Write a protein that binds this ligand. Structure first.
Ligand SMILES: [Mg+2]
Ligand SMILES: [Mg+2]
Ligand SMILES: [Mg+2]
Ligand SMILES: [Mg+2]
Ligand SMILES: [Mg+2]
Ligand SMILES: [Mg+2]
Ligand SMILES: [Mg+2]
Ligand SMILES: [Mg+2]
Ligand SMILES: [Mg+2]
Ligand SMILES: [Mg+2]
Ligand SMILES: [Mg+2]
Ligand SMILES: [Mg+2]
Ligand SMILES: [Mg+2]
Ligand SMILES: [Mg+2]
Ligand SMILES: [Mg+2]
Ligand SMILES: [Mg+2]
Ligand SMILES: [Mg+2]
Ligand SMILES: [Mg+2]
Ligand SMILES: [Mg+2]
Ligand SMILES: [Mg+2]
Lengths: 48, 147, 125, 225, 159, 187
RNA sequence: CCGACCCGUCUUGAAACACGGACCAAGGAGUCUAACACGUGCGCGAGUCGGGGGCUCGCACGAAAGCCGCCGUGGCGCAAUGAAGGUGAAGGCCGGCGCGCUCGCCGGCCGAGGUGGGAUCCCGAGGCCUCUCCAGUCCGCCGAGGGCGCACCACCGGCCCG
């Protein structure tokens, strides 16, 4: 009777920073799309 | 095997595993159990308490066969009979409890260590214990005596 | 089994020779004559060995058949190859690689075959 | 299927190569930032004292917090208290070197072994020469030469140290994980000081070599390694 | 050589402090002791009953038993090369609460609240007590006053 | 030189079975490879326990193993013991047990198989669960040997309950002085 | 050229003004038995052991090996405690009644208890995947937490005997 009394209270709800950016890119998971984007920008060339 | 001992490995060493200083004399500190009360009092008292003195009644011409009374516990009770014996009585609807003679198997007193299976069984023995008789009577078995 | 027999005779066999910090074995079907589980010629279900022919020309390639694992009279099949060197090595390589009969012994048997074949040309002074 | 699995592996290797490129560029820039940080401190210390002399007052520099301790005496005839402190400083041989973070506790410990050690306050250059030349990482209870940046990353990347420059910054400026960084380093096995010591059995202030020499440890380091 | 008496060489140890004779103050008898608390064995010489031995004088132990007029204390006594935990029955006059443990509980109650309070309003706060750090850089003024020159005094024969 | 203490440099531990049994060594060869080339620590525990002596591999009574198996959350799990399984004549209802062991008593073996159990050697267990998945690693009583009764403090010391060494048991053998207050002391 | 005293032995201390040793060859000193204790190896396993005896062509080997089973007498272990008369090792849970009186007769289950550690095992939130996405099948890997807990340790209980 104390567990259920506690339980209902639990469910009573509803700049660039270049160095910091570079570490984010170097993160093996966080920067996967980041380094992928610059990789395709190194090979593909398009005007405008 | 001679080749497996310290003697074959202690060649060339002058003390031969007994020290340059104290050496290996004939019998230091007496022979046998010498000085159990004077200079080996510590060792005798440390490892063998009760060693010195007399306790109790001396009994002349003790015959061990008179006191011969092998014991058996309740947990080992059903091992005296065949495996077929227990299952046949277990499955029987009639209350036919089997007869077990521990004297036949070589026991005179039935002790009451452990718990018995839930089925009646008749025990014949020269002696019982209060708890062994209690446990046997609890499961529907009866206790009889032999001489 | 192969391993079970090996542990029995890894150090207790008549073919075993131990001298001058070396170990050698002299069973008839041993390539390189060294005492090892891989190169033992009697404990495996399938073995291959190269020996000189009865005369001083050609070699004899002997193999173990899959049925006679307990009948030594018919346990082995022998044949004699007495062609040129390059063709002779090809047959031994083909009987090992293409047949997939203990492929690890490919180069070992060929080297032993090379030693035997060169041991039959006349000696020089 | 050969081309399909080949394409799969080429995608693997190219991504790994790009990741190494990303890691190298981070290493390059972090070293660049440290060089900016180093010259900031050097100019600031001068500038702080310069304005004091203009104002007519004095500027006391901060009490130095990094010390390098070198065992100078042998192991024969050492009292147990001195021996225990030396083992806590990982100086189990003559001419061993280690970095000690300075505080009340460490200073009193150095006081006990004052006859047996010679210690001072290394500058930036002294730290650079020690780590690059005599740097050995105690990896998996083994003394491994620090020949690549990857070895530091395998054991200190959780603390953010991934390059030799990162290690130098943590050693020089006492960082959050100085204890993990310094304990990771194998104790420095320095040579005998070329040119000879003055006298090892007496304190430096009395003309010998033991005890504390504030900035003169840099002179001793250059001859030692 | 030395006598094996229980109270040998305790002439000053069990002696009362100067001008501290007389009736024992009754605060000591009004102390309340539990199990697991930490006490320091003093060993006053006013009352000779329940006197701790000289080897336990000044040592520190933890209470495990309580009686009408004494407590049982577990104390680590060093013998030769080994330390083993002795149990001694000592009357309450010879002990007192260890102020070290009381301050330790004082810090812990302060520390747990600080974690509770700072987490509630957001900030991060230091819990571990660092040792004394090196003194940071600071300026020292002169206020138009020169530092006073100090010269070693010439020696003269004092007496 | 350096100031290090060499007395503890060589760790005193087993590396290989002292026995010359080829069958034991063969399955040691198997699990040595298993311990090296897998991640499951269950292989290492089995591997290092194969090096252990007979006294360090005590027999496991059938009653004790059944008691552990009957514990909740262990159903349909393969019991594993590195040693000898021993029959107990103090139990009657033998449940179905899938058990791997180095050695099983024949009367223990017959009871288990008659009760519907399954017996696998250690080589078969490796083919069954190479990672040791779904296994219960039991052991016999290490301190259940008689020699541990004598081990401990000296019998003459106070608060000692160790068995002294006596050639015979009786009222005349080590019961008088030091064992009763009527003679000297009792300690 | 540099370094270098004659060994063995007793000793805190030997090159000693300490004893033994002229040289050479051969011989020469921790063995066997019994009883213990521990460790290790093997077989069997709550049983183990034929060692005494007997049985097999009387015997080169073989004075060996093999077998006994109503030859297991017996030894050791499977029960201890007491001087002795003697006695002698199972409780956990759920119900009605006296009075659930610190309580006895039963009924039902289960079978050596509980606490804290405890390798190992199990469940497991959630993550790792491909040229991609909403669309979902198969198993593999990493893993916060949770559970059963081997042996063993420490403590609390419980039972046996005086
Ligand atoms: Mg020696
Ligand atoms: Mg002496
Ligand atoms: Mg006397
Ligand atoms: Mg010296
Ligand atoms: Mg020079
Ligand atoms: Mg000195
Ligand atoms: Mg050395
Ligand atoms: Mg040494
Ligand atoms: Mg001598
Ligand atoms: Mg002498
Ligand atoms: Mg003298
Ligand atoms: Mg002289
Ligand atoms: Mg003499
Ligand atoms: Mg002479
Ligand atoms: Mg001779
Ligand atoms: Mg015979
Ligand atoms: Mg009998
Ligand atoms: Mg006997
Ligand atoms: Mg526990
Ligand atoms: Mg108790």
């Amino acid at each position: 009777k104390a567990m259920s009394a506690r339980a209902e209270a639990i469910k009573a709800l509803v700049v660039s920073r270049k160095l910091d950016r570079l570490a984010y890119i170097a993160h093996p998971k966080l920067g996967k799309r980041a380094r992928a984007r610059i990789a395709k920008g190194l090979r593909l060339c398009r005007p405008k | 095997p001679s080749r497996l001992r310290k003697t074959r490995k202690l060649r060339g060493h002058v003390s031969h595993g007994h020290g340059r200083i104290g050496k290996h004399r004939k019998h230091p500190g007496g022979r046998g159990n010498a000085g159990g009360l004077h200079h080996h009092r510590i060792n005798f008292d440390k490892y063998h308490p009760g060693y010195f003195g007399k306790v109790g009644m001396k009994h002349y011409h003790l015959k061990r066969n008179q006191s011969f009374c092998p014991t058996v516990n309740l947990d080992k009770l059903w091992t005296l009979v065949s495996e077929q014996t227990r299952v046949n009585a277990a499955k029987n609807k009639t209350g036919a409890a089997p007869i077990i003679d521990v004297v036949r198997s070589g026991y005179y007193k039935v002790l009451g260590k452990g718990k018995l299976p839930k089925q009646p069984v008749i025990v014949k023995a020269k002696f019982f214990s209060r708890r062994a008789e209690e446990k046997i009577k609890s499961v529907g078995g009866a206790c009889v005596l032999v001489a | 089994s192969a391993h079970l027999q090996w542990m029995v005779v890894r150090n207790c066999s008549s073919f075993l020779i131990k001298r001058n910090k070396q170990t050698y074995s002299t069973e008839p079907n041993n390539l390189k004559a060294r005492n090892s589980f891989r190169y033992n010629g009697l404990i495996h279900r399938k073995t291959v060995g190269v020996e000189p022919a009865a005369d001083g020309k050609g070699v004899v390639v002997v193999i173990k058949r899959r049925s006679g694992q307990r009948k030594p009279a018919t346990s082995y099949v022998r044949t004699t190859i007495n062609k040129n060197a390059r063709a002779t090595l090809s047959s031994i390589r083909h009987m090992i690689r293409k047949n997939k009969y203990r492929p690890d012994l490919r180069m070992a048997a060929i080297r032993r075959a090379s030693a035997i074949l060169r041991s039959q040309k006349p000696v020089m002074v | 299927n050969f081309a399909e699995l080949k394409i799969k592996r080429l995608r693997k290797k190219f991504a790994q190569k790009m990741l190494r490129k990303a890691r190298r560029k981070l290493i390059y820039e972090k070293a660049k930032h440290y060089h900016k940080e180093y010259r900031q401190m050097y100019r600031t210390e001068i500038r702080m004292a310069r304005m004091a002399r203009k104002a007519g007052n004095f500027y006391v520099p901060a009490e130095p917090k990094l010390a390098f301790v070198i065992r100078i005496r042998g192991i024969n005839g050492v009292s147990p208290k001195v021996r225990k402190v030396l083992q806590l400083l990982r100086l189990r041989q003559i001419f061993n070197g280690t970095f000690v973070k300075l505080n009340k506790a460490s200073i009193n410990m150095l006081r006990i072994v004052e006859p047996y050690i010679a210690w001072g306050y290394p500058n930036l250059k002294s730290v650079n020469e020690l780590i690059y030349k005599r740097g050995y990482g105690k990896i998996n209870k083994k003394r491994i030469a620090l020949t690549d940046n990857a070895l530091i990353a395998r054991s200190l990347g959780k603390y953010g140290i991934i390059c030799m420059e990162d290690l130098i910054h943590e050693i020089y400026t006492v960082g959050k994980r100085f204890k993990e960084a310094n304990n990771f380093l194998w104790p420095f096995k320095l040579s005998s000081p070329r040119g000879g010591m003055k006298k090892k059995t007496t304190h430096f202030v009395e003309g010998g070599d033991a005890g504390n020499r504030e900035d003169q440890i840099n002179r001793l380091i250059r001859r030692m390694n | 050589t030395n006598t094996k008496g229980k109270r040998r060489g305790t002439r000053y140890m069990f002696s009362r402090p100067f001008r501290k004779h007389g009736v024992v103050p009754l605060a000591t008898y009004m102390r309340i002791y539990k199990k697991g608390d930490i006490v320091d064995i003093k060993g006053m010489g006013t009352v000779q009953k329940g006197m701790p031995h000289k080897c336990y004088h000044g040592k520190t132990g933890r209470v495990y038993n309580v009686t009408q007029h004494a407590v049982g204390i577990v104390v680590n006594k060093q013998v030769k090369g080994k330390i083993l935990a002795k149990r001694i029955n000592v009357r309450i006059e010879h002990i007192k609460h260890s102020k070290s443990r009381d301050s330790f509980l004082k810090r812990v109650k302060e520390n747990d609240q600080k974690k509770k309070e700072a987490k509630e309003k957001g900030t991060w706060v230091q819990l571990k007590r660092q040792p004394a750090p090196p003194r940071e850089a600071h300026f020292v003024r002169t206020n138009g006053k020169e530092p006073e020159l100090l010269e070693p005094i010439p020696y003269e024969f004092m007496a | 030189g350096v100031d290090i203490r060499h007395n503890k440099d060589r760790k005193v531990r087993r590396k290989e079975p002292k026995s010359q049994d080829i069958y034991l060594r063969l399955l040691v060869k198997l699990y040595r490879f298993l311990a090296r080339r897998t991640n499951s620590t269950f292989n290492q525990v089995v591997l290092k326990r194969l090096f252990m002596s007979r006294t360090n591999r005590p027999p496991l009574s059938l009653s004790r193993m059944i008691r552990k198996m009957k514990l909740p959350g262990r159903e349909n799990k393969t019991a594993v013991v590195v040693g000898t399984i021993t029959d107990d004549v103090r139990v009657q209802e033998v449940p179905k047990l899938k058990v791997c062991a180095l050695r099983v008593t024949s009367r223990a073996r017959s009871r288990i198989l008659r009760a519907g159990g399954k017996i696998l050697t250690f080589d078969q267990l490796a083919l069954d669960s190479p990672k040791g998945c779904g296994t219960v690693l039991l052991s016999g009583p290490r301190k259940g040997r008689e020699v541990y009764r004598h081990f401990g403090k000296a019998p003459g010391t106070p608060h000692s309950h160790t068995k002294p060494y006596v050639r015979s048991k009786g009222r005349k053998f080590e019961r008088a002085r030091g064992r009763r207050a009527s003679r000297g002391y009792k300690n």
